[PDB]
Each structure stands twice: as structure tokens, then as C-alpha cells.
């Protein structure tokens, strides 16, 4: 995402923190 579904359309909390856990490794 660029800017659009991050801080301009939520997130949903569901795919977000997916690609972010898995930036991390798997969120530890």
C-alpha cells in the first residue's frame, strides 16, 4: 500500500499485520 489503506481507508487489521508480521520474520 502506498497511502490509502494505512492511514487514508484503515487497514482492516487483518492483511496489514499480516505483511508486517511477516517484515519482522512471523512477529516473533
Do not use: I, P, W
Not at 7 to 24: I, K, P, R, T
Request: glycine content about 8%; cysteine-free.
Amino acid at each position: 500500500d502506498a497511502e490509502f489503506r494505512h492511514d487514508s481507508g484503515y487497514e482492516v487489521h487483518h492483511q496489514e499485520l499480516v505483511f508486517f508480521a511477516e517484515d519482522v520474520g512471523s512477529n516473533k
